[PDB]
Amino acid sequence: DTITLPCRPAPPPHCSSNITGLILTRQGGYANTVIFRPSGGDWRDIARCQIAGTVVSTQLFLNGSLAEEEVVIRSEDWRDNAKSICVQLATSVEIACTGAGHCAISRAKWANTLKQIASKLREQYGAKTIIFKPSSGGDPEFVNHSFNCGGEFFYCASTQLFASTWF
Amino acid sequence: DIQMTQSPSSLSASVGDRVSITCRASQNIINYLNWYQQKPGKAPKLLINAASSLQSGVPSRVSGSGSGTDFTLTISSLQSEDFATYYCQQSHSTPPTFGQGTKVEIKRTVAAPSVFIFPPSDEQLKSGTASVVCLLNNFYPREAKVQWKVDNALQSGNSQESVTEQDSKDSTYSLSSTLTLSKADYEKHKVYACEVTHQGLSSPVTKSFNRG
Amino acid sequence: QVQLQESGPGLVEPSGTLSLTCAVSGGSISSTNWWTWVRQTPGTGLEWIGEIHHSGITNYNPSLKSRVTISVDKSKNQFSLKLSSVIAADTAAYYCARGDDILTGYNYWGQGTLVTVSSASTKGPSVFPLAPGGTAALGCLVKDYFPEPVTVSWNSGALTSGVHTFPAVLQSSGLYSLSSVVTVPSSSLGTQTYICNVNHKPSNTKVDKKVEPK
Ligand SMILES: *[C@@H]1O[C@H](CO)[C@@H](O)[C@H](O)[C@H]1NC(C)=O
Ligand SMILES: *[C@@H]1O[C@H](CO)[C@@H](O)[C@H](O)[C@H]1NC(C)=O
């Protein structure tokens, strides 16, 4: 099974990249259910994570760096929901764009990555229930998994990546 | 935005002294703070980045410290040529906010002004206006008083001033008081004098000339 | 090393748009950096306008979003700032500076260019000489010009010792004015002439003026 992200404009085949981690935001306020939605503040959050490749993207780190043995989540303050959660992967997930306006990600590989990221967020926050919800909303560069590629700029809808619960 | 409040905004030290400027950020900005030096009429110069990394090309006299909501710039051996305004700058989050600035003025021996007076040129007199100039060259401090005397009759309102920023070499000031008149009011009087009061002067100094 | 020089008009009457170009020399705009515009007003301070990546990405200060455009001209190796619907509030000095991988520091700066938002016309100054304790003082009086600045030199940059080019002052007429003075030993007033070179690139006048005693 596969997950197809709608991207406009259509990225060419040679923008087929590796996802090496992402950036989350814990939704504040208030059941023992913690809710994370992919961060989309300003380019400086994505910068500060420093698991950043030359490819200047949002939501997901494309062609960034990988951790060693396993997933490592990081934050400047676990209590400040304003402060993002830099998730860094160990083993990358391939995003492949057919150039028909569609980019594809293995459902297996991604679900696996969520399981792990959930586990670590659980260690940190001590809860039981980890909910991934889509982008909270904002300017188009963030509310969508955006990126540059060959000088051209693309956007992708990613609400299909972040919509699950874990226990 | 992240509010950068410097401290103080204006200070006065000596050649050789240790200068300290603080910068408080509203939010925790980790260590993403930069210090700029800007001399009069020039573009800012990056002293420090990451609140501590001495930008290559700056003296090691300059040093940076702090991380969180408070930061310090130190100049450990101030020199004549550090007369500048210094700015602390955000970098954690757009917009990169700046500080209002700290004005480091170099303090030195009290110096008496060289007072020169200039008649209005025969060029300008034909235009219909006269511009008499009273110059106070190389003095200290910037406190001065300049009064005008046209046939001893005192003048009020028709003078306006402008001061150079401290010199890089000796750190003196230079002051200019322009007395403007019309041609008919200029030809009405003969002896034009300017009188100068200053901290370095025993008595007030006057300089004069006769029209023509 | 890397070097930036701005270009563009220092006057823009209200409503209209400010176009301004940063020319990059000794480095490509297609590097790994961002390119930034910052404005500075006496009294107000330093304000970050926006930045752009070599891949057409654009970050603008919230306060100016509705009005601001940054663009990258890869053919000419430059970037440019376009501010529409300008108000008197925008009267300031405009610098182009290159950071270093949006890592904090704005490393290299351009000399900056001053930009007035005024609905007054442009005109050149008139230059009147200023001629006379052991030391002699000369000067050039630069009266009634708009807009700023003026480029006053002495002996074409040969005599820059003792020179004091005072800051301008806005008249009630709305014309700037200033003097530039210079001390020289008294025994040199007759041995040589002193000539100031006043430039005013707004109205492009390259006035010289000889200063001789009386
Ligand atoms: C990222 O790495 C992939 C390797 O799978 C490559 O195909 C791609 O061109 C790289 N760069 C970008 C901007 O996608
Ligand atoms: C991107 O992902 C593929 C997945 O098989 C991997 O083999 C490849 O090395 C990655 N790209 C590069 C050049 O790192």
XYZ file of C-alpha atoms and ligand atoms in Angstrom:
621
model
C 0.000 0.000 0.000
C 1.101 3.583 -0.734
C 0.193 7.187 0.182
C -0.138 9.764 -2.613
C 0.450 13.410 -1.714
C -1.085 16.037 -4.077
C 1.557 18.594 -5.085
C 1.140 21.788 -7.142
C 3.070 22.506 -9.181
C 4.050 18.932 -10.081
C 7.622 18.108 -8.898
C 9.747 16.349 -11.595
C 11.097 12.791 -10.940
C 14.472 14.199 -9.862
C 12.901 15.826 -6.799
C 12.381 12.302 -5.433
C 13.999 12.821 -2.024
C 14.578 11.160 1.366
C 12.595 12.275 4.441
C 15.041 12.496 7.344
C 12.798 13.615 10.207
C 10.113 16.286 10.663
C 8.992 19.064 13.010
C 5.943 18.823 15.285
C 3.989 21.116 17.611
C 2.152 19.904 20.698
C -1.269 21.550 20.754
C -1.663 23.332 24.103
C -4.716 23.570 26.364
C -6.628 20.401 27.310
C -8.147 13.077 29.043
C -4.604 11.621 28.880
C -4.521 12.265 25.108
C -1.632 14.327 23.725
C -2.136 15.941 20.313
C 0.667 16.763 17.858
C 0.265 18.663 14.586
C 3.150 19.325 12.115
C 4.848 22.623 12.997
C 4.626 25.495 10.522
C 5.746 28.698 12.264
C 8.676 30.372 10.472
C 11.763 29.111 8.643
C 13.753 29.722 11.824
C 12.093 26.851 13.698
C 13.036 24.506 10.838
C 16.513 26.056 10.926
C 17.045 25.728 14.696
C 16.469 21.960 14.404
C 19.766 21.715 12.489
C 18.791 18.267 11.220
C 18.432 20.366 8.082
C 19.786 19.524 4.631
C 20.659 21.977 1.851
C 17.092 21.427 0.621
C 15.025 24.174 2.245
C 11.677 22.534 3.079
C 8.912 22.766 5.701
C 7.034 20.188 7.813
C 9.351 17.395 6.630
C 13.158 17.424 6.422
C 14.189 16.408 2.890
C 17.787 15.260 2.312
C 18.641 16.272 5.880
C 20.717 14.304 8.396
C 19.928 10.954 10.029
C 20.420 9.891 13.645
C 22.415 6.795 14.584
C 20.573 3.875 16.106
C 16.985 5.126 16.422
C 14.621 8.118 16.427
C 15.601 11.108 18.572
C 13.118 13.838 19.415
C 14.396 17.175 20.720
C 13.070 20.480 22.055
C 14.408 23.678 23.632
C 11.673 23.313 26.281
C 9.312 20.340 26.566
C 6.810 22.482 28.495
C 6.603 25.321 25.959
C 4.162 24.107 23.294
C 5.332 27.159 21.335
C 8.761 25.502 21.118
C 8.678 22.917 18.332
C 9.689 19.251 18.541
C 12.524 18.401 16.166
C 11.987 14.748 15.268
C 15.023 13.136 13.648
C 14.854 9.727 11.969
C 17.446 6.941 11.964
C 16.387 5.135 8.778
C 14.999 7.434 6.085
C 11.656 7.209 4.296
C 11.721 7.746 0.527
C 9.344 10.255 -1.083
C 9.096 9.608 -4.836
C 7.433 12.110 -7.183
C 6.112 10.822 -10.526
C 5.780 14.405 -11.803
C 2.036 14.031 -12.440
C 1.323 16.284 -9.446
C 1.703 13.243 -7.185
C 4.389 12.238 -4.692
C 4.342 8.781 -3.101
C 5.359 7.407 0.314
C 5.220 3.769 1.448
C 2.305 3.349 3.877
C 4.282 0.641 5.689
C 7.460 2.709 6.137
C 5.550 5.826 7.222
C 3.224 4.057 9.658
C 6.360 2.516 11.202
C 8.007 5.934 11.564
C 4.874 7.261 13.288
C 4.894 4.316 15.716
C 8.454 5.180 16.752
C 7.905 8.950 16.957
C 4.822 8.234 19.062
C 6.872 6.010 21.388
C 9.464 8.729 22.018
C 6.901 11.519 22.482
C 5.344 9.150 25.030
C 8.630 8.671 26.902
C 9.032 12.444 27.090
C 5.460 13.450 27.948
C 4.745 10.285 29.949
C 1.229 9.872 28.505
C -0.315 6.882 26.724
C -2.272 8.326 23.795
C -0.468 10.100 20.947
C -2.659 11.729 18.298
C -1.265 13.066 15.019
C -3.555 15.685 13.469
C -2.963 17.725 10.249
C -1.532 21.242 9.984
C -3.198 23.722 12.350
C -3.295 26.154 9.418
C -1.499 29.293 8.243
C 0.401 30.745 5.275
C 0.773 28.337 2.280
C 4.526 27.793 2.744
C 3.931 26.040 6.079
C 0.339 24.757 6.154
C 1.584 22.661 3.232
C 4.757 20.563 3.126
C 6.633 23.005 0.886
C 10.129 22.844 -0.641
C 12.484 24.290 -3.258
C 13.957 22.121 -6.026
C 16.112 23.327 -8.933
C 15.188 26.962 -8.180
C 11.458 26.223 -8.496
C 9.174 26.093 -5.433
C 6.555 23.397 -4.793
C 3.826 22.760 -2.245
C 2.367 19.441 -1.083
C -0.706 18.625 1.001
C 0.390 16.433 3.896
C -2.850 16.038 5.850
C -2.663 12.402 4.727
C 0.550 11.819 6.716
C -0.657 13.146 10.077
C -4.011 11.582 10.986
C -3.705 8.670 13.419
C -3.811 7.658 17.091
C -1.288 5.501 18.973
C -1.277 3.613 22.279
C 8.218 40.130 17.718
C 10.939 39.536 20.303
C 11.698 42.741 22.218
C 15.391 43.577 22.609
C 16.032 46.129 25.373
C 19.637 47.309 25.662
C 21.204 48.834 28.768
C 22.295 51.540 28.981
C 21.359 53.562 25.890
C 24.180 56.079 26.375
C 27.430 55.730 28.334
C 30.743 57.597 28.743
C 34.081 55.857 29.402
C 37.826 56.542 29.107
C 40.596 55.266 26.849
C 41.633 51.978 28.465
C 38.382 51.414 30.371
C 36.181 48.301 30.411
C 32.775 48.880 28.778
C 29.734 46.669 29.434
C 26.477 46.727 27.457
C 23.592 44.379 28.265
C 20.763 43.167 26.035
C 17.565 41.602 27.429
C 15.262 39.600 25.143
C 11.542 39.166 25.851
C 11.630 35.438 25.023
C 14.265 32.731 25.384
C 16.218 33.065 22.134
C 18.818 30.443 23.106
C 22.167 31.858 21.956
C 20.955 33.432 18.706
C 22.093 36.986 19.361
C 24.428 39.222 17.341
C 26.352 42.374 18.207
C 26.878 45.161 15.666
C 29.188 48.186 15.746
C 28.116 51.168 13.647
C 30.308 54.263 13.381
C 28.724 57.572 12.174
C 27.541 57.536 8.551
C 28.907 54.017 7.968
C 27.244 50.616 7.575
C 27.011 48.313 10.667
C 29.918 45.942 11.357
C 29.295 42.466 12.749
C 31.320 42.173 15.940
C 29.807 39.013 17.384
C 27.478 36.225 16.263
C 25.963 33.440 18.392
C 26.468 35.891 21.292
C 30.107 34.814 21.689
C 31.784 33.982 18.341
C 34.190 36.848 17.616
C 33.602 37.719 13.962
C 37.006 37.499 12.250
C 38.370 41.016 11.685
C 37.349 42.439 15.082
C 39.820 43.010 17.998
C 39.827 40.450 20.830
C 39.179 43.431 23.131
C 35.543 42.876 22.148
C 33.858 39.891 23.798
C 30.351 38.475 24.126
C 28.495 36.407 26.722
C 25.014 35.315 27.821
C 22.426 32.781 26.632
C 18.668 32.888 27.244
C 17.054 36.255 28.001
C 20.203 38.196 28.945
C 23.412 38.933 27.054
C 26.504 41.088 27.516
C 28.923 42.842 25.201
C 32.232 43.747 26.827
C 34.992 45.977 25.489
C 37.907 45.095 27.744
C 40.243 47.937 26.689
C 38.379 50.853 25.075
C 40.119 53.021 22.460
C 39.601 56.410 20.764
C 38.295 54.520 17.723
C 35.415 52.721 19.433
C 33.208 55.789 19.250
C 30.109 54.076 17.854
C 26.558 52.939 18.474
C 26.245 49.226 19.255
C 23.211 47.080 18.448
C 22.081 43.689 19.718
C 20.091 41.692 17.174
C 17.653 38.776 17.449
C 18.075 35.725 15.229
C 15.859 33.006 16.755
C 12.627 34.003 15.007
C 11.409 36.243 12.169
C 11.290 39.098 12.317
C 14.932 39.533 13.390
C 14.378 42.346 15.887
C 17.099 44.833 16.854
C 17.855 46.755 20.034
C 17.287 50.513 20.266
C 21.087 50.927 20.492
C 23.815 51.868 22.987
C 25.768 55.080 22.339
C 29.373 54.660 23.506
C 30.979 58.115 23.665
C 34.736 58.390 24.323
C 35.593 60.600 27.323
C 38.784 62.671 27.428
C 40.490 65.808 28.799
C 38.440 69.019 28.754
C 39.400 71.087 25.705
C 38.793 74.740 24.815
C 37.172 75.578 21.416
C 39.018 77.338 18.607
C 36.474 80.012 17.680
C 36.410 81.205 14.071
C 33.939 83.630 12.495
C 33.101 83.837 8.784
C 31.516 86.890 7.057
C 28.806 86.252 4.392
C 30.473 85.928 0.979
C 30.049 88.571 -1.741
C 28.526 85.722 -3.761
C 25.568 85.148 -1.437
C 25.062 88.845 -0.652
C 23.921 89.303 -4.272
C 21.381 86.485 -3.803
C 19.710 88.559 -1.076
C 20.702 86.522 2.001
C 23.668 86.556 4.391
C 25.042 83.504 6.225
C 27.504 84.313 9.014
C 29.189 81.212 10.453
C 30.575 80.789 13.976
C 32.745 77.668 14.265
C 33.886 76.017 17.504
C 36.624 73.591 16.495
C 38.023 70.689 18.566
C 36.457 71.130 22.015
C 35.054 68.868 24.742
C 32.484 68.217 26.016
C 29.539 68.825 23.662
C 28.160 71.305 26.186
C 28.643 74.765 24.675
C 26.721 78.044 24.445
C 26.877 80.366 21.423
C 25.268 83.826 21.428
C 25.250 86.345 18.575
C 25.896 90.097 18.775
C 24.992 92.397 15.867
C 26.274 95.829 16.897
C 26.173 94.433 20.452
C 22.387 93.991 20.081
C 21.656 90.379 21.084
C 20.059 87.902 18.652
C 17.350 85.292 19.347
C 15.793 82.766 16.962
C 17.792 83.541 13.798
C 20.560 81.063 14.696
C 20.579 77.283 14.283
C 23.254 74.734 15.124
C 24.805 71.430 14.067
C 27.525 69.373 15.762
C 29.900 66.756 14.341
C 29.976 63.396 16.095
C 33.090 62.697 18.187
C 36.318 62.252 16.225
C 37.897 58.798 15.911
C 41.367 60.085 16.726
C 41.125 62.644 19.542
C 37.376 62.335 20.283
C 36.741 66.101 20.263
C 33.537 67.778 19.109
C 33.048 70.552 16.536
C 30.080 72.947 16.604
C 28.526 75.245 13.983
C 26.146 78.143 14.708
C 24.709 79.772 11.573
C 23.342 83.314 11.802
C 21.185 84.013 8.745
C 19.968 87.497 7.789
C 18.409 89.237 4.790
C 20.494 91.696 2.744
C 18.611 94.757 4.057
C 19.066 93.678 7.698
C 22.725 92.829 7.044
C 23.475 96.252 5.518
C 21.753 97.835 8.535
C 24.593 96.824 10.891
C 28.411 96.810 10.790
C 30.104 94.891 13.625
C 29.143 91.205 13.719
C 30.339 89.162 16.701
C 29.726 85.705 18.147
C 30.398 84.960 21.826
C 31.191 81.459 23.136
C 30.814 79.925 26.615
C 32.417 76.546 27.403
C 33.511 74.434 30.394
C 37.144 74.711 29.256
C 37.060 78.514 28.952
C 38.246 80.753 31.793
C 36.113 83.545 30.305
C 33.713 83.666 27.280
C 35.549 84.214 23.958
C 34.184 86.557 21.247
C 35.156 86.949 17.560
C 34.024 89.776 15.261
C 34.272 91.526 11.864
C 33.053 94.758 10.208
C 30.708 94.525 7.209
C 32.909 95.211 4.169
C 35.829 39.159 -0.868
C 32.049 39.584 -1.189
C 30.833 43.159 -1.743
C 27.424 44.813 -2.053
C 26.544 48.218 -3.539
C 22.971 49.542 -3.608
C 21.531 51.653 -6.429
C 18.254 53.487 -7.079
C 16.423 56.830 -6.513
C 16.753 58.572 -3.136
C 13.452 60.404 -3.660
C 9.984 58.867 -3.954
C 6.936 61.150 -3.690
C 3.977 59.628 -1.718
C 1.678 56.804 -2.920
C 4.276 55.559 -5.428
C 6.797 52.720 -5.235
C 10.445 52.468 -4.127
C 12.589 50.324 -6.432
C 16.139 49.595 -5.231
C 18.837 47.185 -6.451
C 21.683 45.449 -4.631
C 24.557 44.552 -6.962
C 26.633 41.604 -5.733
C 30.327 41.439 -6.655
C 32.805 38.679 -5.775
C 30.076 36.100 -5.062
C 26.991 34.586 -6.723
C 23.382 35.155 -5.638
C 23.013 31.442 -6.391
C 24.947 30.316 -3.302
C 23.606 28.833 -0.045
C 22.813 32.138 1.647
C 19.870 34.478 2.151
C 19.820 38.111 0.979
C 18.318 40.775 3.196
C 16.991 44.332 3.133
C 17.102 46.434 6.314
C 16.069 50.067 6.813
C 17.293 52.459 9.525
C 15.686 55.713 10.705
C 17.270 58.184 13.189
C 15.095 58.049 16.310
C 13.274 54.876 15.216
C 16.217 52.462 14.924
C 16.898 49.353 12.816
C 14.017 47.507 11.146
C 14.307 44.238 9.221
C 12.244 44.347 6.016
C 12.680 40.892 4.459
C 14.981 38.230 2.992
C 15.077 35.927 -0.038
C 16.699 32.593 -0.892
C 18.369 31.846 -4.237
C 15.393 29.509 -4.774
C 12.766 32.268 -4.837
C 11.686 31.888 -1.198
C 10.605 35.143 0.439
C 10.255 36.156 4.112
C 8.690 39.550 4.856
C 8.240 41.488 8.101
C 4.500 41.127 9.003
C 4.240 44.925 9.235
C 5.125 45.405 5.549
C 3.790 42.230 3.857
C 1.018 44.044 1.963
C 3.543 46.363 0.311
C 6.862 44.549 -0.065
C 8.482 42.541 -2.881
C 11.962 41.013 -3.043
C 13.329 39.523 -6.254
C 16.488 37.783 -7.477
C 18.008 38.618 -10.868
C 20.369 35.695 -11.481
C 21.354 37.007 -14.934
C 22.687 40.296 -13.535
C 23.826 38.755 -10.211
C 21.704 41.084 -8.074
C 18.639 41.247 -5.865
C 16.078 44.029 -5.578
C 13.559 45.580 -3.186
C 10.209 47.020 -4.274
C 8.001 48.831 -1.721
C 4.571 49.943 -2.955
C 2.287 52.551 -1.336
C 5.121 54.402 0.428
C 4.396 56.917 3.208
C 6.523 59.572 4.967
C 7.052 56.828 7.579
C 9.412 55.069 5.122
C 11.898 57.978 5.003
C 15.115 56.155 5.954
C 18.421 54.538 4.950
C 18.128 51.271 3.003
C 20.860 48.647 3.337
C 21.321 45.366 1.505
C 23.173 42.821 3.653
C 24.079 39.151 3.214
C 23.685 36.903 6.252
C 25.386 33.508 6.306
C 23.029 30.511 6.014
C 20.291 32.363 7.973
C 22.769 31.630 10.749
C 22.164 34.761 12.767
C 24.857 37.189 11.617
C 24.466 39.681 8.764
C 28.076 39.245 7.689
C 28.767 41.657 4.796
C 26.779 44.868 4.301
C 26.351 47.402 1.510
C 27.139 51.107 1.999
C 23.383 51.737 2.069
C 21.424 54.454 0.283
C 19.185 57.154 1.768
C 15.576 57.459 0.546
C 13.247 60.388 1.269
C 9.473 60.131 0.934
C 8.824 63.794 0.132
C 6.514 65.559 -2.337
C 9.089 68.340 -2.885
C 11.236 68.860 -5.995
C 14.956 68.086 -6.394
C 17.536 70.886 -6.727
C 21.285 71.483 -6.391
C 23.033 73.585 -3.681
C 24.910 76.853 -3.993
C 28.479 76.770 -2.678
C 29.809 79.917 -0.962
C 33.463 79.999 0.283
C 34.486 80.704 3.899
C 37.846 82.522 4.113
C 39.615 84.703 6.763
C 45.925 81.922 16.656
C 48.693 80.604 14.388
C 46.275 78.279 12.553
C 43.886 79.272 9.744
C 40.382 77.942 9.054
C 38.716 77.625 5.624
C 35.305 76.261 4.604
C 32.642 75.685 1.934
C 29.048 76.617 2.774
C 26.540 74.364 0.990
C 23.159 76.087 1.131
C 19.631 75.098 0.063
C 19.601 71.625 -1.529
C 17.201 68.668 -1.753
C 17.297 65.780 -1.297
C 20.229 64.441 0.756
C 23.063 63.779 0.653
C 25.971 65.938 -0.571
C 29.562 64.799 -1.226
C 31.870 67.565 0.007
C 35.618 66.960 -0.367
C 38.750 69.148 -0.262
C 41.493 69.184 -2.923
C 39.835 66.044 -4.349
C 40.668 63.956 -1.266
C 44.265 65.180 -0.851
C 43.442 67.371 2.160
C 41.255 65.370 4.560
C 43.248 66.303 7.669
C 41.413 68.693 10.000
C 38.244 68.588 7.866
C 34.821 68.790 9.545
C 31.740 68.247 7.355
C 28.866 69.120 9.698
C 25.503 67.253 9.568
C 22.772 68.809 7.413
C 19.760 70.647 8.846
C 16.276 70.937 7.330
C 15.221 74.569 6.822
C 11.635 75.796 7.244
C 11.820 75.957 3.431
C 12.364 72.184 3.468
C 15.848 72.520 1.969
C 18.865 70.957 3.699
C 22.053 72.941 4.444
C 25.521 72.440 5.977
C 29.123 73.676 6.083
C 32.434 71.868 5.673
C 35.459 73.460 7.360
C 39.220 72.751 7.417
C 42.192 73.938 9.502
C 45.548 74.570 7.794
C 48.720 76.375 9.075
C 48.390 80.140 8.541
C 51.588 80.301 6.460
C 49.955 78.173 3.742
C 47.054 80.490 2.770
C 49.157 82.161 0.068
C 51.459 79.260 -0.847
C 48.481 77.165 -2.062
C 44.760 77.372 -2.863
C 42.154 75.157 -1.221
C 39.277 73.965 -3.430
C 36.231 72.095 -2.126
C 34.472 69.605 -4.414
C 30.742 69.515 -3.622
C 28.840 66.722 -5.383
C 25.058 66.357 -5.299
C 24.208 63.280 -7.380
C 20.409 63.866 -6.969
C 20.611 66.913 -9.279
C 24.130 65.789 -10.334
C 26.091 68.999 -9.763
C 29.878 68.598 -9.367
C 30.501 72.145 -8.101
C 34.033 73.160 -7.163
C 34.784 76.359 -5.228
C 38.139 78.042 -4.606
C 38.634 79.518 -1.128
C 41.027 82.507 -1.105
C 41.676 85.014 1.763
C 40.778 88.728 1.919
C 17.726 14.758 -2.600
O 18.256 13.440 -2.649
C 17.650 12.611 -3.664
C 18.237 11.223 -3.525
O 17.229 10.210 -3.443
C 17.890 13.224 -5.043
O 17.196 12.450 -6.017
C 17.375 14.660 -5.066
O 17.628 15.282 -6.317
C 17.995 15.473 -3.929
N 17.623 16.875 -3.955
C 16.392 17.398 -3.990
C 16.318 18.892 -3.887
O 15.387 16.703 -4.109
C 17.009 8.015 -0.838
O 16.313 6.813 -0.548
C 16.785 5.614 -1.191
C 15.868 4.503 -0.727
O 16.243 3.238 -1.265
C 18.235 5.405 -0.776
O 18.722 4.178 -1.313
C 19.055 6.562 -1.324
O 20.420 6.423 -0.957
C 18.545 7.914 -0.822
N 19.220 8.955 -1.572
C 20.480 9.338 -1.341
C 21.315 9.629 -2.552
O 20.932 9.435 -0.203
